[PDB]
Structures are given as structure tokens and as C-alpha cells.
């Protein structure tokens, strides 16, 4: 509706018998392949991304936002737990970091 791509803003310009909209949109570029999984199996629990997606660069698993590659460590703050690992098709085994774990550990 407001340009090709994800719309950010628009600017109106007057024209003879008309209006010209300069649509400022966000277009994704320089995409890269990653191995993806629906959920992460940790401690017999299934973890799902709260706002992102699980990606793998080959050896390590991360969670990133869907529209830009920004890999972050899979923690309990960006994932939520629902059910065990027996139901989700394609769940992979990976660790889920706990921010509270170094605090009681030290």
C-alpha cells in the first residue's frame, strides 16, 4: 500500500492536479542461508522463540530477529517453554543458557 518493501514512512509532495508520495520503505538485502529448527530441546523441555527464530551457522544455535541477522545466545529470556520434546516435529537438541545460573553458581 505504501511502497514496495516494509513501509517505514512517506512524504507528500504537491503536483499539478495530484499528489506524489515518496514512500520510504525497508527492503531486506544480502540474505544468508542458515539451518533452522522450530524448537530447542533442553532438559526434556521444548523452547520456542519469544520474538525471533532459531538459526544455526553450522555448529552453534542462536536466536535472531526475523528481518535482520543478529544472532544472540539462546537463553530463557528470549525463549518460552511449552511442553516436552516428544511432540514438536523437527526439534533439535541444544543448550539453553540461564542468566541466573552464574549468580547462584558464584
Amino acid at each position: 500500500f505504501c511502497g514496495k518493501g516494509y513501509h517505514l514512512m512517506s512524504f507528500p509532495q504537491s503536483a499539478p492536479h495530484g499528489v506524489v508520495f515518496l514512500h520510504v520503505t525497508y527492503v531486506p538485502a544480502q540474505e544468508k542461508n542458515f539451518t533452522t529448527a522450530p524448537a530447542i530441546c533442553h532438559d526434556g523441555k521444548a523452547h520456542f522463540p519469544r520474538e525471533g527464530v532459531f538459526v544455526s551457522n553450522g555448529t552453534h544455535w542462536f536466536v535472531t530477529q526475523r528481518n535482520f541477522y543478529e544472532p544472540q545466545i539462546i537463553t530463557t529470556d528470549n525463549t518460552f517453554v511449552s511442553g516436552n520434546c516428544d511432540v514438536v516435529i523437527g526439534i533439535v537438541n541444544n543448550t539453553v543458557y540461564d542468566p541466573l545460573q552464574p549468580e547462584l553458581d558464584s
Binding site: 514496495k4 527492503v27 531486506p28 538485502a29 542461508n33 522450530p38 520456542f48 527464530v53 518460552f80 514438536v88
Partner: protein, 170 residues
Amino acid sequence: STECSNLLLQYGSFCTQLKRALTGIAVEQDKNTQEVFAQVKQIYKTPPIKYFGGFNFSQILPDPSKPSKRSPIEDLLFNKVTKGLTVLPPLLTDEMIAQYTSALLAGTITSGWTFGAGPALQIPFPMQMAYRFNGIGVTQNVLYENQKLIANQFNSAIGKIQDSLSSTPS
């Protein structure tokens, strides 16, 4: 009658006005078809293995057996719709419009909504459906846990759509 044409020349540019208005309508119809169907500049194609996590798109994907390269639903739709006057053919033929729909289907199946906003980014169809579930405010786990049920419901609904179109005249 040559004499009638000679007398018709006395009326001026009525004939030119009518031809120009009809020509405007004729180009407008082709512009309408371009606006509706030609919204992608890439002709996407489906992978040869039609497995999408249980989701069946055979009734909407093009049939290789048919010479028209139409889907079973599109074939049913085409079967169910039936002195100076001329009918100009549309600029986009039925097979090219079907090809445009096939490209849109391949983009929306293999890439979700990414192809409409830029380059087509591949995503597994269950993960795409989970994204769509998040769009309507339902968590991803609901889609993943009930993936076989959701795929069966979708296939049943698509079959019911084909049956409903084939069984209703209006």
C-alpha cells in the same frame, strides 16, 4: 454504403470519440490484469518434492499432466465459467495468468511474505505458518504441537472448497 459514410463525415468526430473511449477501456482491462496478477517480477517455481510439513497444495499448484498448466481448482473454475463488432483478445493469455498465479503461489508457499517485500527468503512452511499464527496472536507452540491436525484441517478445507465449487452452480 459509401454515401452513408459521406453523410456520416458531416457529424464530425463522434466516431473518433467512441473509438477512443473503447480503446481506453480496452487498455484499462489489460492494466487491471497487470495490476492484479503481475505484482512479482520474479517467476517463482515450487521445488520438485512437494512436501511442506503435511500441507497439501495439489489442488492449487499447477498440474503437470494438463497442457494448460492450471491447477485442478483453476481448471474447474475455467470449466464452470462460460457488423463492426470485434472482441480484442486480452494482452495476458489464460496460461500466462495461470503462470503468474503459479509464481505467486510458489512465492507464498516457499518464502511466506518475504517475496512481496523484497527478495524471496526461503522458510519451512510449518515455520511460516507459525509466524502467521503469531500474527493473529497465537503462540508458535500451538502450531507446532498441533501441526498434523492443522495440516489435516487445511487439506480437508481445500478439498471441501473444490467440492463446493464443483457442486454449486451459483
